[PDB]
Paper text:
Endo-galactosaminidases are an underexplored family of enzymes involved in the degradation of galactosaminogalactan (GAG) and other galactosamine-containing cationic exopolysaccharides produced by fungi and bacteria. Whereas the fungal enzyme belongs to family [name], the two bacterial enzymes do not lie in the current GH families but instead define a new family, [name]. The TIM-barrel core structure with fully conserved active-site residues and a negatively charged substrate crevice is conserved among all the families. The putative active-site residues (Asp156/Glu225 for TmGH191, Asp323/Glu391 for Env-[name] and Asp157/Glu225 for FsGH114) overlap well with the experimentally verified nucleophile and general acid/base Asp189/Glu247 in Ega3, Asp196/Glu222 in Sph3 and Asp160/Glu223 in PelAH.
We could not detect any binding, or enzymatic cleavage of the GAG oligomers, for the [name] enzyme, which raises the question as to whether the [name] enzyme is an endo-galactosaminidase or whether GAG is not a substrate for this family. The TmGH191 crystals all showed a varying degree of twinning. The structure is composed of tightly packed trimers stacked on each other along their common pseudo-threefold axis. A pair of adjacent trimers form the asymmetric unit, with the two trimers having slightly different orientations (11.5° rotation around the common axis). The stacks of trimers pack into a sparse honeycomb-like structure with wide wells around the pseudo-63 axis and a solvent content of 82.5%. Sph3 has a rather less charged surface due to its activity on neutral GlcNAcylated GAG. A closer inspection shows that the substrate crevice is partially blocked in ‘apo’ TmGH191, especially over the active site via the loop between βi2 and βi3, with Trp121 bridging the active site and blocking access towards the putative −1 subsite. The TmGH191 crystals prepared in this study were soaked with GalN and GalNAc, and a data set was obtained for a GalN-soaked crystal. While no distinct density for a bound carbohydrate was observed, difference density in the substrate-binding crevice of TmGH191 suggests that something has bound, although it could not be conclusively modelled. Some flexibility in the side chain of Trp121 was noted when comparing the native and soaked structures.
Residue numbers in the entry: 28 to 311
Write the structure that this text describes.
């Protein structure tokens, strides 16, 4: 069910991204972190980002809007002792990431200050992680599911207003949480430029139940039909030249393209640490 696909490929790399390497790789759109090491001192310069723009690559900045990350410029040492009401527990699965009450003004103003830097660096899109934080707080019983969903929708809308006031063409791509559209009045679906998803056909190496995949696709197809691109990333490539492995990459690409999803086969380590070239396939 796969028609609106304005990019031939995409790159997801959050560590060790190299503008020169990317600029001459043949990837069309690259989602990287806004810093070489995530930290303030590693922030890409306007010039380093312009290398990619100059080669016709569309560079997009990852921004985690559902969790505080303890190595970022915004993190404060005082938060360990005098903990803000909106800073919650550490993510068992991602040490150094903390769930936040993303509806509190102070968290929003941190995220706006991060967007401020991303705009000035010359990024052409933002890729917004932990939309699914709405599910986390609902599971914790801290607020209602509807409350959380609304709050996250409104926040992404406020993020769209902030960045488009400065850069009207800025792309806006949330990651995961696409089921949040159940609570959208349609303004979020129209405001995004596209939507990115992890673990659609495969959870790492392991193929998913077809029903689970179809529920997710129900949301993505609707967006596609409205002129919104869908970036897929499955962590299917185990690094080997095995037969199993390459057949799996090819199965993933075929399932992706047949349903309108632009695929990126990433390493099953989850590190997103290199530009993952796969001879004859990625880029294609």
């Amino acid at each position: 069910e796969g028609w609106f696909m304005p990019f031939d490929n995409w790159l997801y790399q959050l560590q060790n991204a190299d503008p020169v390497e990317i600029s001459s790789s043949g990837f069309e759109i690259a989602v990287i972190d806004y810093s070489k090491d995530g930290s303030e001192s590693g922030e890409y310069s306007p010039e380093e980002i312009k290398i990619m723009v100059d080669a016709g690559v569309v560079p997009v900045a990852y921004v985690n809007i559902g969790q505080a990350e303890d190595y970022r410029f915004y993190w404060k040492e005082s938060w360990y002792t005098n903990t803000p009401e909106w800073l919650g527990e550490e993510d068992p699965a991602w040490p150094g990431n903390y769930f936040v009450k993303y509806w509190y003004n102070e968290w929003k103003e941190i995220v706006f200050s991060y967007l401020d830097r991303v705009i000035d660096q010359g990024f052409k899109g933002i890729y917004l992680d932990r939309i699914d934080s709405f599910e986390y707080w609902a599971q914790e019983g801290v607020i209602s599911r509807r409350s959380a969903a609304r709050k996250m929708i409104n926040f992404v809308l406020e993020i769209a207003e902030y960045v488009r006031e400065r850069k009207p063409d800025m792309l806006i791509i949330p990651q995961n949480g696409e089921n949040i559209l159940d609570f959208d009045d349609g303004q979020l679906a129209s405001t995004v430029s596209g939507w990115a998803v992890e673990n659609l056909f495969y959870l790492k190496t392991i193929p998913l139940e077809e029903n689970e995949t179809k529920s997710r696709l129900e949301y993505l197809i609707r967006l596609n039909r409205k002129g919104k691109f869908i970036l897929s990333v499955d962590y299917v490539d185990d690094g080997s030249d095995s037969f199993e492995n390459i057949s799996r990459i090819l199965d993933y690409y075929e399932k992706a393209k047949r349903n309108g999803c632009i695929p990126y086969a990433a390493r099953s380590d989850l590190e997103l640490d290199e530009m993952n070239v796969i001879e004859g396939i990625q880029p294609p």
